[PDB]
Amino acid sequence: MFKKFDEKENVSNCIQLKTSVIKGIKNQLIEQFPGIEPWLNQIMPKKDPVKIVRCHEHIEILTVNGELLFFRQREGPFYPTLRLLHKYPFILPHQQVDKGAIKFVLSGANIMCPGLTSPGAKLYPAAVDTIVAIMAAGAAHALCVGVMKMSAEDIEKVNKGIGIENIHYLNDGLWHMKTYKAHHHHHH
Amino acid sequence: MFKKFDEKENVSNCIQLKTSVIKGIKNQLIEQFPGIEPWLNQIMPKKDPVKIVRCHEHIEILTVNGELLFFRQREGPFYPTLRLLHKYPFILPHQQVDKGAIKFVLSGANIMCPGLTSPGAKLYPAAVDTIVAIMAAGAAHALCVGVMKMSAEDIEKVNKGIGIENIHYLNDGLWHMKTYKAHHHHHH
Amino acid sequence: MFKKFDEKENVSNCIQLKTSVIKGIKNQLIEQFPGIEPWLNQIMPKKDPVKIVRCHEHIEILTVNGELLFFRQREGPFYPTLRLLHKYPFILPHQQVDKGAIKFVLSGANIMCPGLTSPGAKLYPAAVDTIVAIMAAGAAHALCVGVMKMSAEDIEKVNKGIGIENIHYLNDGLWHMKTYKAHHHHH
Amino acid sequence: MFKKFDEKENVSNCIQLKTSVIKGIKNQLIEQFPGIEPWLNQIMPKKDPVKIVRCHEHIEILTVNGELLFFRQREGPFYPTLRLLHKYPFILPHQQVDKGAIKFVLSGANIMCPGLTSPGAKLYPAAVDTIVAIMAAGAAHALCVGVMKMSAEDIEKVNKGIGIENIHYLNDGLWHMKTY
Amino acid sequence: MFKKFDEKENVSNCIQLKTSVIKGIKNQLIEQFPGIEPWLNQIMPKKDPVKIVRCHEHIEILTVNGELLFFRQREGPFYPTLRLLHKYPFILPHQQVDKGAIKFVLSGANIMCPGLTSPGAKLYPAAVDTIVAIMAAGAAHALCVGVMKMSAEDIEKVNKGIGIENIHYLNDGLWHMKTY
Amino acid sequence: MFKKFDEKENVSNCIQLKTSVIKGIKNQLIEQFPGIEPWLNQIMPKKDPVKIVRCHEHIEILTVNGELLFFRQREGPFYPTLRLLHKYPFILPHQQVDKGAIKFVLSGANIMCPGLTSPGAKLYPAAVDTIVAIMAAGAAHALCVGVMKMSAEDIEKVNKGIGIENIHYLNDGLWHMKTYK
Amino acid sequence: MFKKFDEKENVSNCIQLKTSVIKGIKNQLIEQFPGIEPWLNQIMPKKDPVKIVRCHEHIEILTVNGELLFFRQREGPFYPTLRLLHKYPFILPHQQVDKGAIKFVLSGANIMCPGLTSPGAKLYPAAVDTIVAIMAAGAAHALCVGVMKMSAEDIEKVNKGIGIENIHYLNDGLWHMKTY
Amino acid sequence: MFKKFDEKENVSNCIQLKTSVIKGIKNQLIEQFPGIEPWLNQIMPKKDPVKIVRCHEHIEILTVNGELLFFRQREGPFYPTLRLLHKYPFILPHQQVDKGAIKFVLSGANIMCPGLTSPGAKLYPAAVDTIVAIMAAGAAHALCVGVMKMSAEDIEKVNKGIGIENIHYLNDGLWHMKTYK
Amino acid sequence: MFKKFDEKENVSNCIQLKTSVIKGIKNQLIEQFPGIEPWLNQIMPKKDPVKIVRCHEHIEILTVNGELLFFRQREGPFYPTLRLLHKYPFILPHQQVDKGAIKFVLSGANIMCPGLTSPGAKLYPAAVDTIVAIMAAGAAHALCVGVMKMSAEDIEKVNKGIGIENIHYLNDGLWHMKTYK
Amino acid sequence: MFKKFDEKENVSNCIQLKTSVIKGIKNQLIEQFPGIEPWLNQIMPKKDPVKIVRCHEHIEILTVNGELLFFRQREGPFYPTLRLLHKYPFILPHQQVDKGAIKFVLSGANIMCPGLTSPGAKLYPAAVDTIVAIMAAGAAHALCVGVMKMSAEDIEKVNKGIGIENIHYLNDGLWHMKTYKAHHH
Amino acid sequence: MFKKFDEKENVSNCIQLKTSVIKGIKNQLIEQFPGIEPWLNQIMPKKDPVKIVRCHEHIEILTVNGELLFFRQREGPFYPTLRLLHKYPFILPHQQVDKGAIKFVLSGANIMCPGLTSPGAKLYPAAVDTIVAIMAAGAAHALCVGVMKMSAEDIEKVNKGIGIENIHYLNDGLWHMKTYKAHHH
């Protein structure tokens, strides 16, 4: 979603959310990410402003205190940023991709079934549409956020096609953006 | 249950139980935790005073000779303190949480189904409301006491949501309290 | 059964069994423990007296030549002593409990299902009432004699409650008694 | 398909394809091999011309900037070249043959079921007609491109017959051609 | 069958067998133990006499050239001697008992199911009344000849009772007899 | 099939085969052993005569350029010689027998089920009457060619009786014969 | 160092540092923790005020924008807080203590040699006075910051006495303080 | 040291200790077992009486609040009770004995070198006269308190004789005693 | 030492030992087998007669209450009987021989060095003339009592000749004798 | 030696050798490859012609009945063809390279020391200039014939530079040639 | 020693030995193979005749009751037949050769050092001229009798040349002979 994103060109506008909408979004996030519920109050303190940053290609980024927390596209599911996930690694289920596929994950490539069924992978049980943290063997930090396009059962049984769509990866344009800066877009 | 518990602020009153009521409680601890039976006369010597410390949030702690033995909420089921469980670990079934989760369990985080269905975890049969010891591979002693919110059957099938509620963890407020002290509350 | 047993306090009477009674008992032992059959002439030689040591709590110990062979409570099934089991470990199926039950087994604690379902345990088929040797991975000799309270199949399914009752363990009162002595009670 | 192929003798004709034809081949490739999609603008750019090398036995090779990309026969499915597969190995499911079969894979031999069922092999699910990369345990790059003739399930359960047809292998005529 | 057997006390008589009777016995041995068929000319050379040593308790021992080959009781099935089995171990299926059992197997004890279900044992399919070789781990030669009293399936699933009857064991009286 | 075979005693005649017969044998070989197809022009080059060596006990050996390629008995299916199999081990599925059986395989002994079900064996699916290569762990070359008498499923589940018939083995009379004139 | 620490009772005052001192501290932190160098601009941005929180028992905590970064006692070496170490886990060498000893580490207890030589431990080379991250098997977050009291070699070879001094641990008072 | 010990028979006298004697014992305990230092306040609260139970064979047991803490013989080194060691297992180095030895360790037998050199054992560095905890593999708590009679180095090299003297074991007379009054 | 021993043919006489002789034997046994010391009074109760059974080939068997405890030949060191060793296995170091040797160990065969150096053997330090228990991986009980003829060091380094002499084995004549009157 | 070898372009001559000479060639092969001795009567039957195929770059191939047996350059020591080595693999010591190298070994690439010291590799004693078979873990047959350029000891110690020269590899031009005038036999 | 041996062609004479000469041979066998001592009475019963079968190339085979026990060349050391060795395998130290060698061991080929140093081989201490059993991992019985030509130490260190000479292998001519005039007994 961010391979060619550049914070200097692709940010359009920003809105600060009202309380009822913030409460609504928190309810959505807890439904998506039951594992976030323990942490939401420190991630999004009730006193601090919550802002949505609009970018190109209908992308929106949810930010608090300049930190990029979640993003979405075309009003679809929220996804956590890698930076957030590194602090709270259990807000998503994990999938471990084989060593042969890692270079390509770091280039925005989707994860094909054979990258999950080979010996160096570990395929965790996960339903279709589940948002997941993509891990390399031996490294504790997620390298990519993806979404299951096939169930883990089907990835194992079928072993063909896109297993996990790659949404956000280490050193992509969102990674490099790091914080929300009000000086990369006009305000009126 | 005790993440924000402070012995100096959150203890309200204390009652000492009559012999007939103590016998009743013991008969029901035996039902809840059958492994405890031959040990109850040492944990709760027939001669010694048995007291219930009333705390905020409708919490009661069963205590003998200052030692904190069990706790409950709104006269519900008793749960062992971790200090007791460490001495008599056999009195609860255990669940093995993902090995990388230690930090979060030790911050009061609930055990989510993906933390139990991962290859790094071990899920054992357990009905809803079963009280369990939560273990991680890297520690020989239980990190928390949990209560099953979903059956182990449903944790595996549904694989989303709170599987086990984290009710008491190592070095939460109840652990830190360690002993009952009659000088942290008024008596009349 | 013997955690607080003391041979100096808890032995009440002794009887020597008659031929017909001995034949019945040997037939019971063979029925219970078919492995024992060719060893019965050694542990209960026909020419030697067979006695039952009556103890408190309706316990009886079957003894020959001062050796304590089997025991029972309320005239129930016979269970081998650990000393006999160690000499003839084929008498019984076994179950292996996990590390961290060992101290407790050696304190008379029953075996809870979660102690049998973990990776350090080994659980084998055994029906309710089957008499078993309880083993630890860290020890070559049975640490206790148990009786299945739940089948092995149900232990694995339910993973809660008492799976096996610990009836007799290493260094309990019976182990300590070691041999029978007719001076410990009046006749 | 290329054991006796020689560029100097079996290449008859080369055609620089027009935009509509290029665009319909790009679409068939994404259909067969969804992993290739984000890379199609790197191997088949807008700026650069796309050619088909017409060869004997009704064989066609797709090329761009002198690189050989895919091939087909009698207008059948496209198969990646090994050189392309080495750059983008995720394009195909893989199967790992036992060390005893490697010499013969490198001679154009088909992969027989017992080459895939032994303990040095690794056999993964794959339907008949699925195009696959054939791997060795002790080589990092695909040694051959194959097509499943039996499902991996049947390969395992039957353990007899041709499991995978060997279509293109390392150091065959197409490998040696290298560039156009 | 031979725990208390002493060749000096328990042999009654010997019969030299006639041609047709020998042929019948060879037929029976092939039916029982198909693995023996191409070895019969070596263990029972047609040039040499074949004898039955009649013993107490209705035991018979088939012997050729002083070698003790098979034994039976009361016209029942033949069982190989351990010395013959050691030369031709393929005659019988085997079962491997756990290390706690071996001293007792070497005392004539039957094999109880828990001796076959533990991690150091190896239990293989075998029907009731199948004659089997009993092995230890880290002992290359059979330590006893047995007969299944429960199927292997039931041994595994029930894990209680006499699994295999011990008929003949290393250093029993038949072993000690060695030759006739 | 060749334990007591001696080329000096047990070969009666040799027949040079005609084109149509040779084409028919090649078709049979491809059907039996699909792996062999692209190798037939090297093992049976069209420029060289193809012969059947007729032997005692209704045995026939297919030969080209003195090399012994395949054999059969009483018009049964063809089996590869071990020397051919060693050059092209893909002709056949394999079974691995346990260490105790190997001496006996090398004496012409059939493979009993218990020789295939033990920890040191490896038993692979194979229908009854499948021709197979018999392997030892730690010998790289097949030690015998056999034919399944019980399916692999039955071998595993029954564990009694002859599992695989030993047809030809290393250092039998056919191995020793090596080439024909 | 913080077992009985309480931010409400044990904080005395707070001072803001000057440029020349901040530059020297950064040199000191780099000399102690070579791996921190690329990250100091992020952890202590030149723009932002650097403060020292003065606490009881001569303890000082270095803080930037309310975050607790490093601490020291009586102008001793700086130590990272666990919260900072969790973000940059590589700035200290690691020692993994055995699963039997973890409960005690979480009580502030020093680490004895047998908790570091047993099977579930992993001992990495480290001289006396090396500041180390104390880890549990399988978890990427340090549970304790320690200082070597004996070398790793001494610990393995002497296997007696206090091996590592426990300075700061998960859920101690500094952990609970969290911010300033 | 306690195989035949019976609290009802072999306890002579009990003494309450004076402040200076207490300070001296705590100093000796900290010297022997430096890992106990931050726990002494819990096991020997300064406000609580410290007593010594005088027993037969010059044995003394140090007790506070009824709990049996350490013991010694003549004037010798203190040894922790097993009940104490189970609460604070880090205060001694450990040695793991092989499964064959455990029944005998629980009968008061000394640990012979072959019980420490087999694959089920785990032998760690420890000098002669070092007080150690004896562990089993498949059992999580110490089964015996011992004293090295040979160095761990020499146990491994020599593999003969008494490696570790068994001083106190699970279910011996001191274990059974459990508490004092 | 007992392969052809028969109690019905090869026992010459029996003598009852006197007090000072018994005391000396007990001292010698404790020296030889330090692990035995706490058990000697149960194995040889002071009240019960100690006898020596004098057998052919200068063999003597030490017996108490009908049990056969130790034996020697030509006034040499005492060796434990296997039945005694099985009850108290800790009193000897052990060596584990590989699979091929066991049939032969149970036939009185000595242990050759190559049976101790292979991967299925386990060879532990042991000086020349050390009395050892001989184990198989597949059996829980010693199969024979042996005496090192080469040090374990020399066995590994040289890998040729007799490593351990097999003195007494399971179901030899002494095993079979079992008791004396 | 044969990456760009083509039988239809790089072969110049073929000589049949006299009987006297063959006894010396057999002696030389026994000296270099002592395992080959009992097999020489099979490889080079007394009855059959032995020929040398003269090729470009001073290369000669020893042939019998069309089969290519050994090669040499400038009349130096013989090297087995891979096809012969596969039939008699005992005639050379081996070294095993890791998986990364296979594609490159099959491209004529020399073996660099780091390809022999990595976990997937196995190094065995071999002096400099020793002719060796190069194996991959994932293949049962030698993938090339090599010559040690450093001792195996130095390869492990130095871990830098060319360790083994790749002289002949599977499906190079010599492999591809396969036979010489098999029609003539 | 027996690859081309044929009993019907290569046996010349047979002689029965005198009692004292037999005693001497037995003493020699005990010195060579100390494990054999308690078994010699069964292998060579004092009552039964002992013969030597005299063969071509100065080979002698020691026989009793038709069985072939040991062989030697001239008056050199005796080597056990494999059939005897399989019955009493402890009489020789063993070496385990790797999988590639087995087909060739079973063709009489000597064992080259690289066949003993690879991962699937096992090499044990053994001095030059020590008689050894050669095993394969997947076979329980020795496949040949060998004699060390290099010490096991030097085989590992040097990894080149003939390590062990193959003297007698399973199904060579002596194996095939099996018995000598068994109809006489």
For I61-95, what is the HEC assignment?
Answer: EEEECCEEEEEEECCCCCEECHHHHHHCHHHCCEE
Which value in Å is the resolution of this experimental model? 1.7
For residue I61, give the nearest of I12, I20, I110 by alpha carbon: I12
Tokens of B38: 């031959």
Chains K and D touch (3+ CB pairs under 8 A): no
Question: Distance between CA atoms of J175 and E103, rounded to whole angstroms?
Answer: 62
Question: Distance between CA atoms of A5 and A8, rounded to whole angstroms?
Answer: 9
The residues after which chain H has a C–N gap greater than 2.5 Å are none
Chains H and F touch (3+ CB pairs under 8 A): no
For residue D4, the SS3 value is coil
Question: Distance between CA atoms of J38 and J29, rounded to whole angstroms?
Answer: 11
Question: Distance between CA atoms of F79 and F69, rounded to whole angstroms?
Answer: 9
Tokens of A181: 């800066």
Distances in Å between the alpha carbon of E40 and those of B171, C67, F102, F165?
78, 53, 19, 18
Count interface pairs F-K at CB distance under 8 A: 56
* DSSP, residue by residue, G51-72: EEEEEGGGEEEEEETTEEEEEE
Contact (CB<8Å) D160/F126: yes
In the beta sheet, which residues pair with residue H47? none
Neighbours of D127 (CB within 10 A): 14
Which DSSP helix (H) or strand (E) runs through H41? helix H40-43
Question: Distance between CA atoms of J153 and J124, rounded to whole angstroms?
Answer: 8
Contact (CB<8Å) G138/B99: yes
Tokens of H107: 């009968």
Mutation site for B-interface testing, chosen from G141, G166, G168, G169 by largest number of B Cβ within 10 Å:
G141
Distance from CA of A48 to the nearest CA of G (A): 15
For residue A85, give the nearest of A49, A148, A36, A37 by alpha carbon: A36
For residue H155, the SS3 value is helix
Question: Distance between CA atoms of J111 and C139, rounded to whole angstroms?
Answer: 53
* DSSP, residue by residue, B36-99: GGGGHHHHS-TTS-EEEEEETTTEEEEEETTEEEEEEETT---EE-HHHHHHSGGGS-EEE--G
Question: Distance between CA atoms of K173 and K82, rounded to whole angstroms?
Answer: 12
Neighbours of E153 (CB within 10 A): 12
Which DSSP helix (H) or strand (E) runs through D54? strand D50-55
Sheet with E11-16: list strands edge to edge. E11-16, E50-55, E59-64, E67-73, E79-80
What residues of chain J lie within 8 A of the CB of D140, using their CB? 99-100, 102-103
Chains that touch J (3 or more CB pairs under 8 A): D, F, K
Range of the domain at B77: 1-188
- The technique by which this structure was obtained is X-ray
Contact (CB<8Å) F47/J140: no
Question: Which chain E residue has its CA at the smallest distance from C92's CA?
Answer: E114
Distance from CA of J90 to the nearest CA of K (A): 7
Instruction: State the maximum Cα–Cα separation within chain J, in Å, rounded to a whole number.
Output: 51
For residue J144, give the nearest of J179, J121, J111 by alpha carbon: J111
* Cα of C165 vs its chain's centroid, Å: 11
Instruction: State the maximum Cα–Cα separation within chain K, in Å, rounded to a whole number.
Output: 52
Question: Distance between CA atoms of F169 and F103, rounded to whole angstroms?
Answer: 11
Taking 3-state DSSP, the helix, strand and coil percentages for chain K, each rounded to the nearest 5, stand at 35, 30, 35
Taking 3-state DSSP, the helix, strand and coil percentages for chain C, each rounded to the nearest 5, stand at 30, 30, 40
Chains B and G touch (3+ CB pairs under 8 A): yes
What residues of chain I lie within 8 A of the CB of H158, using their CB? 125
Contact (CB<8Å) G106/B106: yes
What residues of chain D lie within 8 A of the CB of A157, using their CB? 125
Tokens of G49: 């005020």
Chains C and E touch (3+ CB pairs under 8 A): yes
CA angle at residue A112 from A106 to A116, to 5 degrees?
Answer: 90
Question: Which chain E residue has its CA at the smallest distance from C85's CA?
Answer: E100
Chains K and A touch (3+ CB pairs under 8 A): no
Of I137, I170, I171, the CB nearest to E138: I137
Of D99, D139, D143, the CB nearest to J140: D99
Which DSSP helix (H) or strand (E) runs through D83? helix D82-87
Contact (CB<8Å) C90/E108: no
Q: Is H73 exposed, middle or buried (0-12, 13-18, 19+ CB in 10 A)?
A: middle
CA angle at residue G83 from G82 to G84, to 5 degrees?
Answer: 90
What residues of chain G lie within 8 A of the CB of H34, using their CB? 161-162
* Cα of B154 vs its chain's centroid, Å: 23
In the beta sheet, which residues pair with residue J147? J131, J165
DSSP character for B167? E
- One-letter amino acid of D62: L
Q: Is B73 exposed, middle or buried (0-12, 13-18, 19+ CB in 10 A)?
A: middle
Distance from CA of E92 to the nearest CA of F (A): 8
Question: Distance between CA atoms of D71 and D172, rounded to whole angstroms?
Answer: 14
- One-letter amino acid of C21: V
What residues of chain E lie within 8 A of the CB of F162, using their CB? 34-35
- One-letter amino acid of F112: M
Distances in Å between the alpha carbon of B78 and those of B25, B67, B144?
10, 15, 15
Residue whose structure tokens are 């169930």: A151
What residues of chain E lie within 8 A of the CB of F156, using their CB? 125
Question: Which chain D residue has its CA at the smallest distance from J120's CA?
Answer: D138
Chains that touch C (3 or more CB pairs under 8 A): B, E, H
Question: Distance between CA atoms of A144 and A141, rounded to whole angstroms?
Answer: 9
Contact between A62 and A70 (Cβ < 8 Å)? yes
Three-state SS annotation for chain J: CCCCCCHHHHEEEEEECCHHHHHHHHHHHHHHCHHHHHHHHHHCCCCCCEEEEEECCCEEEEEECCEEEEEEECCCCCEECHHHHHHCHHHCCEEEECHHHHHHHCCCCCEECHHHHCCCCECCCCCCCCEEEEEECCCCCCCEEEEECCCHHHHHHHCCCEEEEEEEECCCHHHHHCECCHHHC
* DSSP, residue by residue, H44-103: S-TTS-EEEEEEGGGEEEEEETTEEEEEEETT---EE-HHHHHH-GGGS-EEEE-GGGHH
Mutation site for B-interface testing, chosen from G2, G106, G135, G168 by largest number of B Cβ within 10 Å:
G106
Number of domains present in the structure of chain D: 1
Neighbours of A35 (CB within 10 A): 25
Cα within 13 Å of Cα(G173), Cβ side: 17
Tokens of J163: 């360790």
Distance from CA of K38 to the nearest CA of J (A): 39
Question: Distance between CA atoms of F28 and F32, rounded to whole angstroms?
Answer: 6
Contact (CB<8Å) C114/B93: yes
Distance from CA of F122 to the nearest CA of D (A): 9
β-strand F131-136 against F144-148: which pairing, if any?
antiparallel
Tokens of B139: 């520690």
- Beta-carbon contacts of C31 under 8 Å, excluding residues fewer than 6 positions away, are none
What residues of chain E lie within 8 A of the CB of C92, using their CB? 114
β-strand D67-73 against D59-64: which pairing, if any?
antiparallel
- Beta-carbon contacts of E100 under 8 Å, excluding residues fewer than 6 positions away, are C89, C90, E115, E118, I140
Distance from CA of E33 to the nearest CA of I (A): 24
What residues of chain F lie within 8 A of the CB of E130, using their CB? 160
Question: Distance between CA atoms of E148 and I176, rounded to whole angstroms?
Answer: 28
What residues of chain E lie within 8 A of the CB of F109, using their CB? 35, 38-39, 90
In the beta sheet, which residues pair with residue G135? G96
Contact between B173 and B152 (Cβ < 8 Å)? no
* DSSP, residue by residue, C117-186: SSTT-B-----TT-EEEEEETT-SS--EEEEESS-HHHHHHH--SEEEEEEEETTSHHHHH-B--GGGS-
In the beta sheet, which residues pair with residue F73? F59
Of C99, C120, C138, the CB nearest to H102: C138
What residues of chain K lie within 8 A of the CB of E45, using their CB? 182
Chains B and C touch (3+ CB pairs under 8 A): yes
What residues of chain J lie within 8 A of the CB of K109, using their CB? 35, 38-39, 90
Cα within 13 Å of Cα(K53), Cβ side: 24
Contact (CB<8Å) E90/F158: no
What residues of chain J lie within 8 A of the CB of K119, using their CB? 122
Contact between G119 and G101 (Cβ < 8 Å)? no
Contact (CB<8Å) C162/B126: no
What residues of chain A lie within 8 A of the CB of G47, using their CB? none
- CATH code for the domain of F148: 3.10.400.20
Of B86, B106, B139, the CB nearest to G99: B139
- Beta-carbon contacts of F111 under 8 Å, excluding residues fewer than 6 positions away, are F95, F97, F101, F105, F134, F146, F162, F163, F164, F165, F166
For residue B119, give the nearest of G86, A165, C124, A152 by alpha carbon: A152
For residue K2, give the nearest of K81, K93, K62, K63 by alpha carbon: K81
Contact between F38 and F30 (Cβ < 8 Å)? no
For residue C89, the SS3 value is helix
What residues of chain C lie within 8 A of the CB of E117, using their CB? 124-125
A101 phi and psi angles, rounded to 5 deg:
-95, -15
Contact between B71 and B63 (Cβ < 8 Å)? no
Tokens of J117: 């010291």
Of E45, E47, E140, the CB nearest to K140: E140
Contact (CB<8Å) G159/H38: no
* DSSP, residue by residue, G114-177: HHHHSTT-B-----TT-EEEEE-TT-SS-SEEEEESS-HHHHHHH--SEEEEEEEETTSHHHHH
Question: Distance between CA atoms of H152 and F68, rounded to whole angstroms?
Answer: 66
- One-letter amino acid of A58: H
J41 phi and psi angles, rounded to 5 deg:
-70, -30
DSSP character for K171? T
G115 phi and psi angles, rounded to 5 deg:
-75, -15
Distances in Å between the alpha carbon of J142 and those of D99, F139, J86?
11, 17, 7
Contact (CB<8Å) A114/D126: no
